[PDB]
Amino acid sequence: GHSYEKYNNWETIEAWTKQVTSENPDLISRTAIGTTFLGNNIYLLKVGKPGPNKPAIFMDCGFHAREWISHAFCQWFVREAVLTYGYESHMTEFLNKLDFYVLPVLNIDGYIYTWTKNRMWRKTRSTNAGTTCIGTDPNRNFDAGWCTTGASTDPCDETYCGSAAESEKETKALADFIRNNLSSIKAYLTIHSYSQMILYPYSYDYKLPENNAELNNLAKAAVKELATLYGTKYTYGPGATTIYPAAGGSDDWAYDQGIKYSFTFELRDKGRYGFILPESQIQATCEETMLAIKYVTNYVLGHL
Ligand SMILES: CC(C)[C@H](NS(=O)(=O)c1ccccc1)P(=O)(O)C[C@H](C(=O)O)c1cccc(CN)c1
Ligand SMILES: [Zn+2]
Numbered sequence: 001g002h003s004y005e006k007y008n009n010w011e012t013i014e015a016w017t018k019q020v021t022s023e024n025p026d027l028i029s030r031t032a033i034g035t036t037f038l039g040n041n042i043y044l045l046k047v048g049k050p051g052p053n054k055p056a057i058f059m060d061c062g063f064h065a066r067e068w069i070s071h072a073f074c075q076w077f078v079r080e081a082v083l084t085y086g087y088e089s090h091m092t093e094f095l096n097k098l099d100f101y102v103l104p105v106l107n108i109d110g111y112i113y114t115w116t117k118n119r120m121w122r123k124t125r126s127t128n129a130g131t132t133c134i135g136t137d138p139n140r141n142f143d144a145g146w147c148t149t150g151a152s153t154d155p156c157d158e159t160y161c162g163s164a165a166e167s168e169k170e171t172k173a174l175a176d177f178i179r180n181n182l183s184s185i186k187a188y189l190t191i192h193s194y195s196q197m198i199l200y201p202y203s204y205d206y207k208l209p210e211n212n213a214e215l216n217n218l219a220k221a222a223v224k225e226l227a228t229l230y231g232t233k234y235t236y237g238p239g240a241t242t243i244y245p246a247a248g249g250s251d252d253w254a255y256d257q258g259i260k261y262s263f264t265f266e267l268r269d270k271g272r273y274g275f276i277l278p279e280s281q282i283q284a285t286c287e288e289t290m291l292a293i294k295y296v297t298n299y300v301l302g303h304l
Pocket of ligand 2 (some may be wrong): 067193
């Protein structure tokens with residue numbers, strides 16, 4: 001069965017998306033936005049109090065298969081939203097005024113592979129012509145300085161950028177959805193681990209975003225709020241200098257679409273456990289991360 005303080009396999013997460021929706025139809029609707037290479041359904045949960053128009057914030061988890069705390073956070077976020085609506089002032093206004101588009105797992109095929117074969121798998125599980133090597137790095141597969149830096153053109157490498165921008169069914173599905181709903185999406189948030197960072201554009205170039213000062217002030221405030229809960233220290237800044245240059249990322253691509261608030265989160269930890277974060281830290285990690293997400297949400301709403 002499903003637990004919010006354990007890592008859940010896809011079969012369980014899938015059944016969870018159905019159950020949590022069935023149990024909260026006045027706050028959640030579920031749609032599929034596409035299929036993965038291996039035929040799994042890419043679910044999207046629209047969280048919020050239904051109403052005409054409504055702006056939105058898009059958040060995805062599970063870009064990279066082995067980053068299990070990411071998948072855990074999207075689920076945690078959804079429960080928080082539904083349980084506290086009507087009782088906590090901020091979440092109530094949030095869900096009244098806007099929708100969160102939550103995509104609990106993008107790279108489902110890879111996630112399954114980490115459960116069944118190799119816990120440290122990263123990429124998708126699509127085949128590549130002319131080689132036995134499997135998979136593309138989804139966060140090198142977007143049309144943002146595609147494959148110009150921090151990427152590989154070799155299918156056998158962990159940062160393979162693919163045959164072309166959006167060559168992967170999953171990345172195409174996400175890009176198609178965001179393009180189809182551009183007018184309403186005001187912020188883009190993508191969840192990864194590990195390193196304890198909040199990153200903003202650009203990662204494919206050392207150039208700074210037009211609203212760099214605002215984004216830095218936002219990231220700084222968000223990390224301060226996150227630390228209030230358990231003292232967890234994050235760093236923040238543009239992708240290229242805060243971690244390293246990496247072209248083709250979803251956050252850079254979302255920003256260049258005109259989504260002015262675009263962030264990558266790198267959750268716990270700093271490398272003691274790395275990708276293999278113990279389930280005993282799921283609760284604390286998700287709790288402090290909620291604070292930063294809600295802070296960003298509060299800000300974005302005030303600057304519509
Ligand atoms: C521990 C994390 C820092 C992950 N890095 S990693 O798995 O150790 C790694 C190791 C070797 C090559 C590429 C990535 P990540 O979440 O996978 C970092 C991510 C990416 O590589 O896609 C990243 C890096 C630079 C900029 C961004 C923002 N678009 C995002
Ligand atoms: Zn990642």
